[PDB]
């Protein structure tokens, strides 16, 4: 829309904060000021971020809009922004949209970034996006949806990031990710998925970031990651995963050549799906460099496992195998794959794994001798003083290489903190010590 005469700012943006908005953009002393469509017409660019706007009525008289920015504010209606067909880029995030009109976004053919994460979005129209050519990155986070309608998607061939997480997704439709060739981050995570179709992410070739984490899932197709050949970070955490599921994302680490980090950290896999994990590692040309096994349920034989996929993982620099019940026989199974000729790890966190003295003496002769390890954390261990000093002893040796010990809340007394970062000094290649909440948090 235009208008024919010199109009009142506030006459044309009912709103006070935008009219004001409009103002200051402009330069004019007040927002009674009268303005001509020509000046509405300079205006190529809104920041209006947090400016407390209700509505922007007469933001359809700024046709040259290319950028837009209204995050933070109280919109619960956009109708007005559908013919801004130069807007290349929208920010709506943080404002109180409950629904979306059907067409809406029809006319914005220039729109490569679009975001509106954090509203109230209970569900997307058919067809909400279905003009969106140039569309790159969609912002869907932070809202309340819980289905996505076949073929929301499927005209965005350009799109390289689409973000839905923190929604209550509770499925996925079939083809809801079909041509989505050029996405390389895809970010469910937060949502209440109890399920993957087959083949969900089949076309997803370009894909580097997966993440899936705090879901409901359990088991998993076989398939379901299998022509993701480009993914690098597949997050999988926080979920109820299976050993059955474990048949799926070991054939995610044999076709995806590089990948290199596998977040599988609150899940219920057990030894036996840790297994199937360490046969896919078992195989020559791993490239996985991170691996979180926290809280997997794990026991001190799926510690000889693992040991036997870092005998032959070297790729393997850091590994977390916190809030597990490992022991001193689980200590004792990691210790020899430490002084394997050509371990490559780097950083191992033990923390809360049930360590006692009798594993601290374990763990003592890895301590002792040159290795790739340099970051130990075995935080939330009731190790023990006695527990400590044999750590303290192995380190004391010269042969030691360590560099990072955390022994964060290991129910030592100021007595022995101090006693321990005493000795500290000694230990030539050790340069930092974690001794908090031992005695005083």
């Given at each position: 829309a235009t208008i024919?005469?010199?109009?009142?700012?506030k006459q044309?943006?009912?709103?006070?904060?935008?009219?004001?908005?409009?103002?200051?953009?402009?330069?004019?002393?007040?927002?009674?000021?009268?303005?001509?469509?020509?000046?509405?017409?300079?205006?190529?660019?809104?920041?209006?971020?947090?400016?407390?706007?209700?509505?922007?009525?007469?933001?359809?008289?700024?046709?040259?809009?290319?950028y837009l920015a209204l995050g933070g504010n109280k919109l619960h209606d956009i109708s007005a922004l559908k013919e801004l067909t130069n807007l290349g880029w929208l920010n709506l995030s943080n404002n109180q949209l409950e629904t979306l009109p059907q067409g809406v976004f029809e006319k914005l053919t220039?729109?490569?970034?679009?975001?509106?994460?954090?509203?109230?979005?209970?569900?997307?129209?058919?067809?909400?996006?279905?003009?969106?050519?140039?569309?790159?990155?969609?912002?869907?986070?932070?809202?309340?949806?819980?289905?996505?309608?076949?073929?929301v998607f499927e005209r965005l061939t350009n799109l390289t990031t689409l973000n839905l997480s923190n929604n209550q997704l509770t499925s996925l439709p079939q083809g809801v990710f079909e041509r989505l060739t050029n996405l390389t981050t895809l970010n469910l995570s937060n949502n209440q998925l109890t399920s993957l179709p087959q083949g969900v992410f089949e076309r997803l070739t370009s894909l580097t970031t997966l993440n899936l984490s705090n879901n409901q899932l359990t088991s998993l197709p076989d398939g379901?990651?299998?022509?993701?050949?480009?993914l690098k970070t597949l997050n999988?955490?926080?979920?109820?995963?299976?050993?059955?599921?474990?048949?799926a994302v070991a054939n995610a680490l044999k076709?995806?050549?590089?990948?290199?980090?596998?977040?599988?950290?609150?899940?219920?896999?057990?030894?036996?799906?840790?297994?199937?994990?360490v046969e896919a590692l078992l195989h020559p040309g791993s490239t996985l460099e991170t691996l979180d096994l926290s809280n997997c349920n794990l026991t001190k034989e799926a510690?000889?496992?693992?040991?036997?996929?870092?005998?032959?993982?070297?790729?393997?620099?850091?590994?977390?195998?916190?809030?597990?019940?490992?022991?001193?026989?689980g200590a004792a199974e990691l210790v020899e794959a430490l002084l394997h000729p050509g371990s490559t790890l780097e950083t191992l966190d033990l923390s809360n794994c049930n360590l006692t003295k009798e594993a601290c003496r374990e763990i003592a002769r890895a301590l002792k001798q040159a290795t790739t390890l340099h970051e130990l954390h075995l935080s939330n261990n009731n190790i023990g003083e006695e527990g400590a000093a044999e750590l303290v002893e192995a380190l004391l040796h010269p042969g030691s290489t360590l560099?990072?010990?955390?022994?964060?809340?290991?129910?030592?007394?100021?007595?022995?903190?101090?006693?321990?970062?005493?000795?500290?000094?000694?230990?030539t290649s050790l340069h930092e010590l974690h001794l908090s909440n031992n005695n005083i948090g």
């Open positions: 024919t005469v010199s109009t009142p700012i044309i943006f009912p709103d006070d904060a935008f009219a004001e908005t409009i103002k200051a953009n402009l330069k004019k002393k007040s927002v009674t000021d009268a303005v001509t469509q020509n000046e509405l017409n300079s205006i190529d660019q809104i920041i209006a971020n947090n400016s407390d706007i209700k509505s922007v009525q007469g933001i359809q008289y700024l046709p040259n809009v290319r220039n729109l490569t970034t679009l975001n509106l994460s954090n509203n109230q979005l209970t569900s997307l129209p058919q067809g909400v996006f279905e003009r969106l050519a140039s569309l790159t990155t969609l912002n869907l986070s932070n809202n309340q949806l819980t289905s996505l309608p076949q073929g379901v990651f299998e022509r993701l050949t480009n999988l955490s926080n979920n109820q995963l299976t050993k059955e599921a474990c048949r076709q995806a050549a590089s990948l290199h980090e596998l977040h599988l950290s609150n899940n219920n896999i057990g030894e036996e799906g840790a297994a199937e994990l510690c000889r496992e693992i040991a036997r996929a870092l005998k032959q993982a070297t790729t393997l620099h850091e590994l977390h195998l916190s809030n597990n019940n490992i022991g001193e026989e560099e990072t010990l955390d022994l964060s809340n290991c129910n030592l007394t100021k007595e022995a903190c101090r006693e321990i970062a005493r000795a500290l000094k000694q230990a």
